[PDB]
Design a protein around this ligand. Sequence first.
Ligand SMILES: Nc1ncnc2c1ncn2[C@@H]1O[C@H](COP(=O)(O)O)[C@@H](OP(=O)(O)O)[C@H]1O
Length: 275
Amino acid sequence: KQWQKPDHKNPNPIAFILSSPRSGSTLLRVMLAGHPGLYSPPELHLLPFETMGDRHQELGLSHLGEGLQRALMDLENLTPEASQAKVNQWVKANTPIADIYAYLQRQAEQRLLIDKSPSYGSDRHILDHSEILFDQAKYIHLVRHPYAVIESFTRLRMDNPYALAESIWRTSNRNILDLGRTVGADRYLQVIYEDLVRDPRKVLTNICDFLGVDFDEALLNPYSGDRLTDVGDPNFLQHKTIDPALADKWRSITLPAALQLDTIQLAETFAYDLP
Ligand SMILES: Nc1ncnc2c1ncn2[C@@H]1O[C@H](COP(=O)(O)O)[C@@H](OP(=O)(O)O)[C@H]1O
C-alpha cells in the first residue's frame, strides 16, 4: 500500500525512539520527557497510518494510541472527554497523519517532539513513511540483548512464543539498522540498553549531543514529577531507579533452543556475547 507523498515535506525537526519491544524504550522515553527542550509523550502510534480514519479503522476499540489523547491533554490543558473529542473530530475529517505531526510540533512550541515506538520497526514499510513525511527526522535505535528481550517478551504473554519473540527482535533490529544505513550518522544513533542502564549520564549525554540539546539532570530521574506515566511498559512503575541489574538478565537465562543463524549475526553487529 503506497504512502501519499505530501505536497511539501515537513522541514521541522522530529525524532523517533525505535526498538524491538521489551528493550527499555519506556525508560528511555520517560528519561527524555524530563528534559525541558524535548517533548516525549507516551506512544502516539501515528506513523503506520495514512489518515486518522485508517488509524481509527485499524485501532478501533484498542487502548494502543491513547498516548495521543494524553499528549493533547498535557500540551493543551484538556480533560479526557475534550481530548477524545479532538481525536474523534480528526477521525471524522480523515485528517492526514502528516497534519497530526505538524500539529503536535506546533503545540510542542520550541520543544523537539519524540515519537517512541516499539512496533514501527516491525515493518520496513511503516519506517519508510517517516522519510516520505519529513526532511530532518532523527532516529534513536535502542538495542537490547536478544536473550533479555526473548525472556521478557515470553513472561509478558505478548504472543512457539520463543521463536516469535526472537523473530520480532530480529525483524525490528534489522529494519531499523537498514533505515539507519539509508540516512546519515547525522540522523541515526544506536543506543545499547546495557550501556544506558550502567552509565545513564554518559549515554544520555551522547543522545543529547545527537538531538542538539544540552544535558539536563532531570534525564536521570525518570521516577520524579509528571512524565505522563499515569501504553508502554506495564511494569514501569514497579522500579525505584535506573536499575543496572536488569541489564544482566540475559546472563541467568537459557532459552529452550539455540538462536537462528541470522539472529546471531545481527546480535554480533551490536557486539553482544551469545553462550
Ligand atoms: N527503571 C528501569 N531501569 C532499568 N530497566 C528498566 C526500567 N524500567 C523498565 N526497564 C526495562 O525495560 C523493559 C521494557 O522495555 P519496553 O519499555 O521497551 O517494553 C523492562 O522489561 P521487564 O519488566 O520484562 O524486565 C525492563 O527490563
